[PDB]
């Protein structure tokens, strides 16, 4: 926390929520890719 209250780092309820989460998923994408796999990214599970 900015006051040193030891708060989480998850962004929820702020406008930057989708942007932060897409940055998270692309982080994991690149982490997986750098291990040697370069064919397909993480799939999306449709529920609509």
């Amino acid at each position: 926390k900015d006051d040193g209250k030891r708060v989480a780092c998850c962004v929820h309820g702020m406008a930057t929520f989708p942007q932060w989460h897409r940055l998270y998923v692309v982080q994991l994408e690149q982490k997986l890719g750098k291990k040697g796999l370069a064919d397909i990214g993480v799939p999306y599970w449709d529920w609509t």
Partner: protein
């Protein structure tokens, strides 16, 4: 032997590759075996 080479290419294509298998050229004279295969351990600076 042509079928063997084709199957090897198709098998290796799905493991992160772009072009076909390089061919050695032993017809042209050389003084040493290829350095691509000579070594036992090579240093990759990708992992340093």
């Amino acid at each position: 032997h042509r079928l063997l080479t084709v199957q090897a290419e198709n098998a290796l294509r799905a493991k992160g590759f772009q072009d076909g298998l390089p061919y050695w050229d032993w017809t042209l004279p050389m003084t040493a075996l290829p350095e691509i295969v000579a070594g036992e351990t090579y240093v990759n600076p990708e992992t340093n």
